[PDB]
């Protein structure tokens, strides 16, 4: 199920808990029998219950958003990957970032998901000392690592995992130029 889940966050550049809330919002408009992981994912749900769907209420045309959406020709359904397209648009529950995503995995050296300290230091080392021209010492880069940790690892786990990792640039708008996180 994690390597199923995780081929729809390489394809949309969400995140593993967006793409979570939405597997369970889609399960639950499938027919019973269905709510399998592997078997849900092949599912597609009908316009019935895409139209109905609570962010689309306030939208004149949901008829046209429904046919858009699907990828489908034959059939008049949302599969999984249709219905997160359609959340990345009209709910504030699924945001795509695709800086964060590879900027993520960039830093993720051992590709498992998290960023630890050993992870986090390469990412606080690409900030300088105090001149234009300068690098870190050991005691800066551990109080940098420190402070990441602190305003961001919210679930206390000592590291840092995609979601975390959004706000800890969140405040960076040029953070992709050379790696540099604003303070
Ligand atoms: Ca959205
Ligand atoms: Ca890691
Ligand atoms: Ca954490």
Redesign the pocket.
Known sequence: SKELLAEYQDLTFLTKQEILLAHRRFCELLPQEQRSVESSLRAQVPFEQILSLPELKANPFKERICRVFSTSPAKDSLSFEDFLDL??????????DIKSHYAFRIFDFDDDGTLNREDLSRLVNCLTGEGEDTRLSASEMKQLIDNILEESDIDRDGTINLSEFQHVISRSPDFASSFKIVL
Not at 88 to 94: L, P, Y
């Open positions: 959340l990345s648009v009209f709910s504030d529950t699924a945001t795509p």
